Design a binder for these strands. Structure first.
Length: 94
RNA sequence: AUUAAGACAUUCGUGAGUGAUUUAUUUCCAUGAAGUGGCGU
């Protein structure tokens, strides 16, 4: 298969700077680089360089010389648009 | 006065007719709006 369509659960609230949109959800700008780093670390059995050579051999890298990025497309969309919005501070107030 | 004399290689005639500088090509690739709390044991 060429597509992975995962449904994920929220356990603790996310602090979001672009909250003014009702479609605000997980930003793949954080997920994709960290997921690439994690995937390559697992590929090399704990070593990032070995995983990079692994992805280099299997042609999974966008670039084989410069960066850590893997070739796939990440999309995160809200199914139901209802949001529970929290105020987060350091002290307790009435 | 002599196998001599006389006679513009000249007249007319469009370098013209037909014809896309067009076809193909992602302004894209990488990238965390994030980090930290401090003060009177």
């Amino acid at each position: 298969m060429n597509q992975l369509t995962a449904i994920l659960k929220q356990h603790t609230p996310m602090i979001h700077f672009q909250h003014n949109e009702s479609g605000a959800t997980l930003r793949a700008s954080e997920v994709k680089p960290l997921l690439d780093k994690f995937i390559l670390t697992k590929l090399g059995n704990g070593d990032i360089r070995e995983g990079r050579l692994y992805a280099k051999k299997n042609n999974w890298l966008i670039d084989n010389e410069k960066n850590y990025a893997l070739n796939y497309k990440l999309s995160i969309s809200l199914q139901k648009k209802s949001r529970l919005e929290y105020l987060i501070t350091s002290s307790t107030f009435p």
